[PDB]
Amino acid sequence: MAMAMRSTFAARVGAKPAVRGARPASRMSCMA
């Protein structure tokens, strides 16, 4: 659902979330 895009965006503001946050599984769910 749109939550996937919300989350991808809310990561890509910083990028970090999706590389450093999602180092191991320490994120949530997302489009990417």
User: What is the distance in angstroms between the CA of the first residue and the CA of the last residue of the chain?
Assistant: 13
Q: What is the DSSP letter of 8?
A: H
Q: Which of 11, 29, 9, 31 minimizes the C-alpha distance to 20?
A: 11
Judged on CB neighbours under 10 Å (0-12, 13-18, 19+), 11 is buried
Contact of 27 with 11, CB cutoff 8 Å = yes
User: Using CA atoms, how far apart are residues 1 and 25, in angstroms rounded to an integer?
Assistant: 20
Q: How many residues does the chain have?
A: 32
CB crowding 14-32: b at 16 or more within 10 Å, else e:
eeebbeeeeeeeeeeebee
Method used to determine the 3D structure: NMR
